[PDB]
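Appendix B: a complete holo record

For completeness, this appendix reproduces one full record from the ligand-bound portion of the collection. The bound molecule is X3V. The inputs are the chain sequence and the ligand SMILES; the output is the full three-dimensional arrangement of the complex, encoded as structure tokens. No fields have been trimmed.
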Amino acid sequence: DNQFYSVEVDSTFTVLKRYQNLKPIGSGIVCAAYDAVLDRNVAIKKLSRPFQNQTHAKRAYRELVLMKCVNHKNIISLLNVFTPQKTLEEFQDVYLVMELMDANLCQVIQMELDHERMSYLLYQMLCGIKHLHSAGIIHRDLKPSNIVVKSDCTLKILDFGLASFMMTPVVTRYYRAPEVILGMGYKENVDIWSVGCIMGEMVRHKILFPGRDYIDQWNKVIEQLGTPCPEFMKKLQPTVRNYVENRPKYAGLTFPKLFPDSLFPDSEHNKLKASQARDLLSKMLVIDPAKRISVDDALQHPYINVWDPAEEQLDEREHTIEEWKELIYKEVMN
Ligand SMILES: O=C(Nc1cnn(-c2csc(C(=O)NC3COC3)c2)c1)Nc1ccccc1Cl
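The structure of the chain with X3V bound, as generated:
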């Protein structure tokens, strides 16, 4: 009779009966399942009471909305959105359904990958970001835990970035651009830094800029790339300027030392690709956005250009719990 059924997977998933054989894959928590109507495997993500606070509410709502503003194979697209609750007063949970993938990009980064695989992943990450930029969306918080891959090397970005306080048991900040670390103005190529942080981790198999807080993180950036030029300092607020100028200076190691040929593959082809990879890196991991490569110029770097012309409820302010609940509920039921 009822359209939904419930299964305990530490959380309770109450889902439509078309979705069967639920099992955990990652932590909103996400299950894999078989969709009997579409005859294919899907992923299901549960948002529990996303209206419970402004952080969860703002992200749930904008990401629900922004779905309909994007249609790109490298960007998440939803197959289904539902709530088992029957009315606004009873509304609690949102379920989101998408194509089931094979792995998270974190897992992929731990593997040795040939240049064909690495360069195609990056090409796709750059297409996605370019498509987001075309639709007036600048991510600013791209990181591998929110990117998923299929065995055929195809990739999808699952989130839409920054618009705080978290009352729960943490956010990953290591892929954020200096503009974000230091609170500067930004433009599209803020997202290139993140790609470069991913690319470099693919090579080194270690997070490039770890740290407890932005303090450590910035140390790691300067120690490795050197202190930026005065033209960069002038773009900083006077208070963060004082902070940055008074940190110990650093000459900054060259990129051959940062990514030596030992981390790259036996053939002239691989020798040439390694130098092209290092080159792209050195253009992406550039502290000053004025001298950092753009999405378009990156897409035509020789490392990347081997992979196609075909491949070219607005954001709201602060609301209360009850208003967010209604905004989100309405979106779920168009
Ligand atoms: O994480 C989300 N999606 C997603 C898809 N695939 N994966 C995934 C990671 S690993 C893995 C795997 O192990 N698959 C094996 C088991 O048979 C092959 C599959 C994760 N979130 C998401 C979900 C729905 C709507 C919106 C959002 Cl954002």
